[model samples]
Target: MAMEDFVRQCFNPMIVELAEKAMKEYGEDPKIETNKFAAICTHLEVCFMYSDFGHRFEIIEGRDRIMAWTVVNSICNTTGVEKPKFLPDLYDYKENRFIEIGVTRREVHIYYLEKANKIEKTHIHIFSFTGEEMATKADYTLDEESRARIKTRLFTIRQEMASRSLWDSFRQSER
Candidate 1:
C-alpha cells in the first residue's frame, strides 16, 4: 500500500487511542481543572518523530512497526539511489522520493522499543518540520512540579516477549 493509505489504515487508530489516553490522563490530573483540560483537548495533535526507511519494521500485535517499513521500502525500492547512508539503523530516502513524501533530507526512521507503559513497538520517524505555521504554537511543556508528579510514577516499556501486568489495562484496552 502507499504511505498515506498505510497510515490511514494502520496508524490512525493508534493516534486516536493515544489522544484519548492523553486527554483522559490530563483531565484526571488534579492541577488541571476539568474545564481547562476540556478547553485544550481539541488542540491535541498527533506528531510523528521518526523517518528512517531502511530498518525492518517490528512485528507488533495489532499494530506493527514493520507495517511502516514496507511502505518506506516500497517507495525507496523503486528508486535508483546508491547505497544509502546509515545512522544506528536508518537510511536516507532518494531525493525525489523523499520530497514526494514530504520528508526532509536529514530525517531518519526506526522502530524504537518505546517504553512508556506497555511494550509499544512504535514506528518512530525522527525528523524536523519546515512549515511557518509552527512558529505560533504554544509551549505545552510540563512545569517542574508536574514533571515531579510523573517522575515518581513513570512506567517503563517492556520487550514484546516480556510479561505485562493487568494494570497495563490502559493500553490493553486500546488494542
Candidate 2:
C-alpha cells in the first residue's frame, strides 16, 4: 500500500546488496554515470513465487500502489515459466509463523515494487536481474502483452468505481 509497507514486506537487505555489487563491478561505463551506492538504495525489487496457495506474485507494471492478487489454482493457469527464486534472503523469513494466527500454511511469495516503497519519481534505473530468476514453472513470464491487459483492467475497474461513486452521490442528494 505504501513504501514503508513495501520495504518491510520485501526481500531482505542482502539480495539488494548483491544487485548493487554487480552494477558497480560490471557496469563500469562512466558515460552512464556511476551511482552505485544510490542505485542500490533505490530501483530494485524481487520476491519469490513460492506460496502455500500455489500462486506467485507479479507486478502489473505501469501502475503504483494497490497490490492486487493473481491466484493460480494450478500451474496450467500461469505462463508456464517459474521465475527462479533470485533473492535467497527471502528464504530466511519463510516459516509458518501464521500458524499462530490460525493459518496452517506459510505464504512465502511476494511481489512488491520500488515505487511502492520510495514514493518518489525515480530515474530510469540501472540494475541487473538474476535473468531467469523470475521465470516460473508455468512459463508465464509477464511480458509486454500481459502488461497491457493489466493496464486495461485497472482502467476499467477505476471507471466502474467512479461511476458507482457518482451514482451514490446523486441518489443521496435526491433522497
Candidate 3:
C-alpha cells in the first residue's frame, strides 16, 4: 500500500480510536485525565518507531523505503491498526522521513529529540523508542542491539541543531 494510504488506512484510525478509548474508558472530563495523554502520546510513539526501525514514513532511497514499507505492514498487522492519515496534516509523501503538507504554517520533522514541541528552539522532531515503549505484542521483531543502532543513526544525522554564536560583541553593542 502507498504510505499516505497506509496512514489513512491504519495509523490515523488507530490514533483516533485510542484517543476515543481514552475519553470513554478514562471518562469524559479531559481535565481529570492527564494519563489519557498516554494513549494519544503512544500512537505518535509508534509512528516514531515506524520511522526509526523500518523507516515507515521515511522517504529515503529504494532499499530504505522498501524496508520501511515492510515494517509498516508488520506494525499495522501486529497492532491491528489499518493505515490511516498518519500525519493528520497533509496527504503526501516525499524523499524524507516526513513530507510537508501545505496546510501547515510551521515545520514538522522526525529527529527524536526528547523535546519535540519546545519553542525556545525551532523545529519539531520525532524519535523512535524501544522496550518499555514498544507497546504490547509488536516489539519482538527487533532486538535491543538493533534498536541501539537505529538510535545512534538518529543522533548522527539529526539535520537540525541550528546554532548561532552571539560572540558577546553583539550584546555589548545593544546595551
Candidate 4:
C-alpha cells in the first residue's frame, strides 16, 4: 500500500486515541497543555516506530522517520499549534534511535513493549485538516505548500539514505 494509505489506515485511530487520552488526563490547563501535547506526539512517534506496517516501510532506513515528521509538522502547522519541542529528538537521525525523556517516556516504554509483543500493531493515516472541515473536504487533502514540502523532504531523505548506504559499502570495502 502507498504511504498515504498507511497513514490513514494505521495512524489516524491511534492519534485520535492518544489525543482523547491526553485531553482527559490534562484537561484545559494551559500550564501543562504543551506537555500533554508533547506526550501525545511522543506516543504517536512510538506507535509509528513499532507498528507492523511501519516495520515494512522502514526497510528503506529513514522512511518512517521522514513520514512521521512530515505528517506531524503538517498537522501542527495547519492547526496553528506549536509542534512538539522534543519531536526532533524523537526522530533524530543521528542516533537512529528514540531518546527516552520525561515521565512520558515511561508510558512510551510500556507502549513499546506492547508493540514488541505485537499487541499494538495498528497502522496510521496521513490525515490533514480539522474535523469541522471533514464534510467540506470529504477527502484528507493537504494544502499545496504542505504537499510541496512533504515531497521535498521525502526526496532529501532518500538521498541521505542512498549516501549512507554508499558510505557503508565504501567502509566495508576498505576493511
Candidate that scores best on lDDT: 4
After superposing candidate 1, which stretches have Cα over 4 Å from the reference? 1-14, 18-63, 81-95, 99-175
lDDT of each: 0.26, 0.26, 0.33, 0.34
TM-score of 3: 0.23
Error of 1 at 113 (Å): 26
Candidate 1 accuracy as TM-score: 0.22
Per-residue lDDT, model 1, residue 42, is 15
Q: Of the candidates numbered 2 and 4, which has the greater lDDT value?
A: 4
lDDT of 1: 0.26
Q: In order, how many clashes per candidate?
A: 14, 20, 18, 12
The per-residue C-alpha lDDT of model 3 at residue 90 equals 14
| Candidate 3 residue lDDT tens string, 96-158 | 222211111112122222233222211132233221222112323345675565445333222
Cα miss at 7, model 2 (Å)? 28
**Residue 56 shift from truth in candidate 3, angstroms:** 5.2
lDDT of 4 at 174: 15
Sum up the clashes in candidate 4.
12
